[PDB]
Design a protein around this ligand. Structure first.
Ligand SMILES: [K+]
Ligand SMILES: [K+]
Ligand SMILES: [K+]
Ligand SMILES: [Mg+2]
Ligand SMILES: [Mg+2]
Ligand SMILES: [Mg+2]
Ligand SMILES: [Mg+2]
Ligand SMILES: [Mg+2]
Ligand SMILES: [Mg+2]
Ligand SMILES: [Mg+2]
Ligand SMILES: [Mg+2]
Ligand SMILES: [Mg+2]
Ligand SMILES: [Mg+2]
Ligand SMILES: [Mg+2]
Ligand SMILES: [Mg+2]
Ligand SMILES: [Mg+2]
Ligand SMILES: [Mg+2]
Ligand SMILES: [Mg+2]
Ligand SMILES: [Mg+2]
Ligand SMILES: [Mg+2]
Ligand SMILES: [Mg+2]
Ligand SMILES: [Zn+2]
Ligand SMILES: [Zn+2]
Lengths: 127, 91, 97, 202, 25, 212, 63
RNA sequence: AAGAAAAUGUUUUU
RNA sequence: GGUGAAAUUCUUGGAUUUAUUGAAGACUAACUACUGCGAAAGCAUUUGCCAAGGACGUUUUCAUUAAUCAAGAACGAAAGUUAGGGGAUCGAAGAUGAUCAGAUACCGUCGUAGUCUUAACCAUAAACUAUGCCGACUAGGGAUCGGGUGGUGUUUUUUUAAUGACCCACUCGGCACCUUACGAGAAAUCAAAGUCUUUGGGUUCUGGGGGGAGUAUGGUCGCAAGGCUGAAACUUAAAGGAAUUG
């Protein structure tokens, strides 16, 4: 009854991606980011920008024919953050409110069994 | 008795060519003239002919090797890689 | 003098402990000395658990949690208020709040 | 003579006449006398075997690689040199390889190569240490040694010749569009000076 | 002045003094 | 100016032969044309779909299944098993402090032609009357438990085909066998087969593909 | 222009660097089974009707 | 969740 | 992309994102602890091989074979040097962008050496518990690691039972911890920093106000950087430790 895709919310810091794709992931549908919705070079990670981007992506999904999305949330991961940005939460809520059905929430943040040497030097960013 | 303190094989070169170059030549000449264990007959009878050729005085087997040593690290790594790929292909 | 009875870390009988990187500034800190806080936070709260439940296609999904162990250097922990400066007598209280 | 890498004499049977055909391979390191060499599409992935590039897995190290199927070996023939299989393209059958210089090349999957690295490696790590040893090295290769510097000549002899001090006089970087007799120095140099930076440009 | 950088400065002075000593004979 | 989704045609994935249910969803691809066939664009796609969505039973909320397309038969993508993995949330929930984590992995060829690597996990637990608050293992028992688990996995694979191993993973009987064979060493609350990785496939063999 | 109104059911507290705004737990007049936290700058009390341009906007604290 | 800048102050005397 | 904000930079030759594969090198997350092993530096994936070791048990053996140790040796983090290999990430130098009054700094993007490995050097760290090693004695308490003994012990199936885990009691050895201090200390604090003017169990090393100075010179080691040994002239009334109130 429902057509399932994948939601693929990448909430980094400084920006957020809402990437709706097919079940396989090869074919993409309306990848829209908060940088496409606001123009300040600093607000890409704003929850308002994330909500606007998610609303546009969900509208395009409903016009293409997608009814529900299996949600995969991820952060920058690797060696950098492992913590979702502020905008992924707003993106998920906006996708839920824009009429799309939501299924199978999953965190796919890339977590190493151990890392390459982290950026910043041993003493880190000294601000 | 010990005849030279540090020059060793390069004592034939006298004071010429510089200490650093004589040191490098010492290292590679020692490798080149060392006697090696035969992988087939189990004896320490493998010596270099020309560069890259290592012949065993017993059992007369000849093996292609490095210029100054029987097996280079590159060839050891290549042997390991080819063994892994071969095991993957046949398994 | 010596501020802390054992040390500003937890290492007795070892000599060396492998370091960990601060999540906030990337400073290199030994694993024992780093301030480690575990986060089991619900993956979607957003004051919107009921909203996601309404939008869901599965009845009683039982949404997951996101797990993340954060390691902080002393400076970053103090600045971000994971830990606070305590009095001489309060420093000796290892129990969590 | 004149070659750093040793050669391996490998005897095959003639499939169409009763006789032996002896071939002169470049010995890969680890190959020994009395060893059986298997050459063909169905040969196993053992050191010394000759296989088409399309029949080997990714990351395989090969030597004496063919640029075209049947040219009998053009790439990775000097001592210690080797080619890595870095990709396959089953349709329009081609194999991507990385050459010793680091260049990426696309070769037909029917081109052949020998498993392993060319023997005699590490040859250039030993200082020649003597003008005489350089003399004997080039005595068996060609008449290209010793080399007189162009600045040490007269103006009739070389572009760099002449002058009351030994100096080039003009930029030694020479255009690719220069003609014969002008191409002395650094031909079509993209840059000069002590190399600062990395290799394998994007 | 930090003792580490004072040590570094003293090392530099020692190398300079040794070099001048060697230049003289 | 392009609107590329008008030239795309929809396919339905008839993913399994044996899990519970054939229909897992749909995918889209460009309309097959002179030089870029839709069948070539497909047949390499991988869909990761929840075992709960396969079986209709919510007790499989973890254990996602990987299925890659092998063939096209009239808008139907027939797939076969490509790998199995637990969910990150479930793995992190199982991993807790004040207990020993046991991880084993084996590489083994299935009965017919398939090469797999099985990743199994276990966790130490306290006894019912235990007072000590961590319940750690002594690492020699850990070696014995790893040996037992490896033997069990080696026996269960290579005596069964890939389909039989799938039909054995779904009811989770290997977990109970590991529990029974390791109970005499430690309780080991949380035996699970956390991952199955497909390392090498045999020749395509559409004949055994068409077993659904 | 989207139309939505709400009624504050609880006052959270003062907010802002200068203390200029106040956080209110506010319940939508239509679909009363829905509550959000909002930031309002003027003087407010309990049981006050406000007008919202957007419905889905979590108002966070102002550092 | 986080949030821009801030160098300097003669000697002796209390 | 990046930041508090920027900018350098990439980008309709399709950047970022997604999917399927593959390669390379590093590393060994979570489990991970006031937990373990080692002489220290250190040591965290599986399995195999090789030798090694502590604690315990012992109605085993030898019988003083022992403690600490100038001279003398083995090992010795990181950085650094030489020659090969390798060079994914980070990244002294360097190149750029911004800030600034200046900013060849913090911040940002690259990036050589280095980071990894083999064969050699180097032999230094806030190499720290700033607490030499061996031995005896002097409080109370609960945990925990390894071994052993005992129990009408709980749970687990073998077939009565037994190994396994667990509970309780005892004991040896260990990393530690809490309380109080008979006592000690300038105090911070200390079960050793106690058994100390009521001063002696054995032994090694080191210091004699602060600078000059780990410098000059000599020797010695090292390829080098430097290491070890190591003054004085001269100058100075303080420098320093702990704690108290502002
Ligand atoms: K930010
Ligand atoms: K000239
Ligand atoms: K590098
Ligand atoms: Mg931006
Ligand atoms: Mg700061
Ligand atoms: Mg202080
Ligand atoms: Mg240390
Ligand atoms: Mg020349
Ligand atoms: Mg010349
Ligand atoms: Mg002349
Ligand atoms: Mg001329
Ligand atoms: Mg000219
Ligand atoms: Mg003043
Ligand atoms: Mg691990
Ligand atoms: Mg342990
Ligand atoms: Mg001594
Ligand atoms: Mg500048
Ligand atoms: Mg090094
Ligand atoms: Mg010292
Ligand atoms: Mg000391
Ligand atoms: Mg003081
Ligand atoms: Zn022999
Ligand atoms: Zn930090």
């Amino acid at each position: 009854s429902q057509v399932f895709g994948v939601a693929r919310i990448y909430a980094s810091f400084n920006d957020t991606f809402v990437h709706v794709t097919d079940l396989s992931g090869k074919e993409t549908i309306a990848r829209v980011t908060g940088g496409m919705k606001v123009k300040a070079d600093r607000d890409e990670s704003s929850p308002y920008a994330a909500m606007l981007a998610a609303q546009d992506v969900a509208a395009k999904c409903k016009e293409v024919g997608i009814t529900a999305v299996h949600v995969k949330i991820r952060a920058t991961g690797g060696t950098r953050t492992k913590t979702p940005g502020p905008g992924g939460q707003a993106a998920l809520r906006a996708l839920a409110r824009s009429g799309l059905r939501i299924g199978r929430i999953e965190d796919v943040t890339p977590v190493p069994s151990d890392s390459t040497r982290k950026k910043g030097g041993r003493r880190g960013r000294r601000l | 008795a010990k005849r030279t303190k540090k020059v060793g094989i390069t004592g034939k070169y006298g004071v010429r060519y510089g200490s650093s170059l004589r040191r490098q030549v010492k290292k590679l000449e020692i490798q080149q003239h060392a006697r090696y264990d035969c992988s087939f007959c189990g004896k320490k009878t493998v010596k270099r002919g020309a560069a890259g050729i290592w012949t065993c005085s017993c059992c007369k087997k000849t093996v292609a090797g490095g210029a100054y040593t029987v097996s280079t690290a590159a060839a050891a790594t290549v042997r390991s890689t080819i063994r892994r790929l071969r095991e993957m292909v046949e398994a | 003098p010596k501020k802390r009875a054992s040390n500003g870390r937890n290492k007795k009988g070892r000599g060396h402990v492998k370091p960990v990187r601060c999540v906030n500034c990337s400073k290199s800190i030994p694993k024992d000395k780093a301030i480690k806080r575990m986060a089991i936070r619900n993956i979607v709260e957003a004051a919107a658990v009921r909203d996601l439940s309404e939008a869901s296609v599965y009845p009683e999904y039982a949404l997951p949690k996101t797990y993340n162990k954060l390691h902080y250097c002393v400076s970053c922990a103090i600045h971000a208020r994971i830990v606070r400066v305590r009095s001489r007598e309060d420093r000796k209280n290892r129990a969590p709040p | 003579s004149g070659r750093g890498a040793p050669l391996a004499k490998v005897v095959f049977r003639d499939p169409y006449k009763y006789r032996l055909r002896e071939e002169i391979f470049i010995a890969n390191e680890g190959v020994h006398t009395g060893q059986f060499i298997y050459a063909g599409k169905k040969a196993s992935l053992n050191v010394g075997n000759v296989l088409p590039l399309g029949s080997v897995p990714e990351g395989t190290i090969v030597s004496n690689v063919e640029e075209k199927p049947g040219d009998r070996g053009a790439l990775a023939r000097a001592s210690g040199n080797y080619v890595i299989i870095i990709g396959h393209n089953p349709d329009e059958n081609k194999t991507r390889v990385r050459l010793p210089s680091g260049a990426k090349k696309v070769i037909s999957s029917d081109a052949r190569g020998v498993i392993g690295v060319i023997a005699g490696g590490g040859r250039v790590d030993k200082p020649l240490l003597k003008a005489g040893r350089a003399f004997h090295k080039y005595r068996l290769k060609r008449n290209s040694w010793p080399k007189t510097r162009g600045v040490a000549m007269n103006p009739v002899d070389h572009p760099h010749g002449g002058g009351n001090h030994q100096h080039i006089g003009k930029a030694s970087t020479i255009s690719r569009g220069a003609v014969s007799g002008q191409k002395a120095g650094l031909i079509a140099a993209r840059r000069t000076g002590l190399l600062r930076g990395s290799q394998k440009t994007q | 002045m930090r003792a580490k950088w004072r040590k570094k400065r003293t090392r530099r002075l020692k190398r300079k003094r040794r070099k001048v000593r060697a230049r003289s004979k | 100016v392009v609107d590329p989704f008008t030239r795309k045609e929809w396919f339905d994935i008839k993913a399994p032969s044996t899990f519970e249910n054939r229909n897992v969803g749909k995918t889209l691809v460009n309309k097959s044309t002179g030089l870029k066939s839709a069948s070539d664009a497909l047949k390499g796609r991988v869909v990761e779909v929840c075992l709960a969505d396969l079986q209709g039973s919510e007790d499989h909320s973890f254990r996602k299944i990987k299925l890659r397309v092998d063939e096209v038969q009239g808008k139907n993508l027939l797939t076969n098993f490509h790998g199995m993995d637990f969910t990150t949330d479930k793995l992190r929930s199982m991993v807790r402090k004040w207990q020993t984590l046991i991880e084993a992995n084996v590489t083994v060829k299935t009965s017919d032609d398939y090469v797999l690597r099985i990743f199994a996990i276990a966790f130490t637990r306290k006894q019912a009357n235990q007072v000590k608050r961590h319940s750690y293992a002594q690492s020699s028992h850990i070696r014995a438990i790893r040996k037992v688990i490896s033997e069990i996995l080696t026996k269960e694979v290579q005596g069964s085909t890939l389909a039989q191993l799938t039909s054995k993973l779904i009811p989770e009987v290997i977990n109970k066998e590991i529990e029974n064979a390791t109970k005499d060493i430690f309780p080991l609350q949380n035996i699970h087969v956390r991952k199955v990785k497909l390392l090498k496939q045999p020749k395509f063999d559409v004949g055994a593909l068409m077993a659904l | 222009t989207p139309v939505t109104l709400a009624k504050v059911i609880k006052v959270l507290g003062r907010t802002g660097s200068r203390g200029g705004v106040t956080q209110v737990r506010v319940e939508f007049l239509e679909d009363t089974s829905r509550t959000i936290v909002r930031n309002v700058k003027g003087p407010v009390r309990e049981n006050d009707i406000l007008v919202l341009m957007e419905s889905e906007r979590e108002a966070r604290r102002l550092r």
